[PDB]
């Protein structure tokens, strides 16, 4: 008997090949530039690199037999062409009979889709190779990669609730920490935008610098995620909606006017600091201790988030607040327009 996840996976891929279907091939051939060969090459490159890392031991990850790697890979390739066909068929340009060459020639989409497929398969088998293992192995930037998850969730309805939950979890992981690492492509995108961080109001309502759209979507997801977390905290801490709006305003200020604070840190660290300093200055005060016990009941919350925090060297959240956060945000805080809460 297979586990529910692996049997579900088996149901999704039943009767299908690790090659393009006739329908997909036809779409490929209606393009001025037919992607089919370059797509094969990407899967071949990804497949080889995956097998090399899978079968070799890193001291944190005992290596595993090539026959299992290939079976994992094969399954992910079947999923890839299935989801790609679904995506291409439902595309607007396809429905209007317009050439999809430019759409189909973006390498980052195909790489991300194949990685997400590999992640689906690995998860289904309860692999020890935990995200972000697959995107570090394949050299996929978190800032680019996360965008495919929502496409996958949309384009394959055969995914289980548990599979979708996992995909949402690793998107949250990217949004909260991984895309903020010092070497993330996020910083590049902000850079060509003159380090102008979009405000919540700007992205939560419908010749540009490139990555403008990428910046807008990423921060929309970030603002959306942080608002959900802040709403829960305010509920469990039973705070007025006015302090909530003030806490939100302070948090946005740190994202927009102190974005370097997020580099190599965690989104929730800035959100919890925003909570306390605003509760403090408005005399609605809650202790950081009760702030954090309320925080820890959230799904993403692990001890290291407020216990291990980057200082310059690591310390708990309180030390971060005192030696770093206060100095930067106290001018804005001591000042208590308020931002819209999503």
């Amino acid at each position: 008997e297979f586990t529910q996840s692996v049997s579900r996976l088996q149901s999704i891929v039943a009767g299908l090949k690790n090659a393009p279907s006739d329908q997909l091939i036809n779409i490929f051939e209606s393009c001025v530039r037919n992607p089919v060969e370059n797509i094969m090459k990407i899967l071949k490159g990804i497949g080889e690199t995956f097998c090399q890392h899978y079968t070799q031991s890193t001291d944190e990850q005992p290596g595993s037999h090539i026959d299992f790697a290939v079976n994992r890979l094969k399954l992910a390739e079947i999923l890839y062409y299935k989801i790609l066909e679904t995506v291409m068929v439902q595309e607007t340009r396809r429905l209007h009979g317009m050439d999809m060459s430019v759409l189909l020639e973006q390498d980052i989409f195909h790489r991300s889709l194949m990685a997400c497929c590999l992640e689906i398969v690995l998860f289904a088998y309860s692999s020890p190779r935990t995200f972000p293992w697959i995107i570090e192995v394949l050299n996929l930037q978190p800032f680019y990669f996360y965008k495919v998850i929502e496409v996958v969730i949309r384009s394959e309805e055969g995914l289980s609730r548990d599979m979708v939950k996992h995909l949402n979890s690793i998107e949250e992981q990217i949004l909260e920490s991984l895309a903020w690492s010092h070497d993330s492509a996020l910083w590049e995108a902000l850079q060509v935008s003159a380090n102008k961080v979009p405000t919540c109001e700007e992205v939560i309502f419908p010749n540009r610098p490139k990555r403008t759209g990428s910046l807008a979507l990423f921060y929309r997801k970030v603002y959306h995620l942080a608002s959900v977390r802040l709403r829960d905290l305010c509920l469990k801490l039973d705070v007025s909606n006015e302090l909530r709006r003030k806490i939100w305003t302070c948090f946005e200020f740190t994202l927009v006017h102190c974005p370097d604070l997020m580099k190599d840190r965690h989104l929730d660290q800035l959100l919890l600091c925003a909570f306390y300093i605003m509760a403090k200055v408005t005399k609605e005060e809650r202790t950081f201790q009760e702030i954090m016990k309320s925080y820890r009941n959230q799904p993403q919350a692990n001890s290291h988030v407020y216990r291990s925090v980057l200082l310059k060297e690591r310390g708990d959240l309180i030390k971060f607040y005192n030696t770093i956060y206060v100095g930067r945000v106290k001018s804005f805080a001591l000042k208590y327009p308020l931002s819209p809460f999503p």
């Binding site: 306390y276 300093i277 403090k280 200055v281 202790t287 950081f288 201790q289 216990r307 708990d316 309180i318 607040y321 005192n322 206060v326 106290k330 805080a333 001591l334």
Partner: peptide
Amino acid sequence: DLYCYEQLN
């Protein structure tokens, strides 16, 4: 004043 004088756990 705006500093946090609490400690942990």
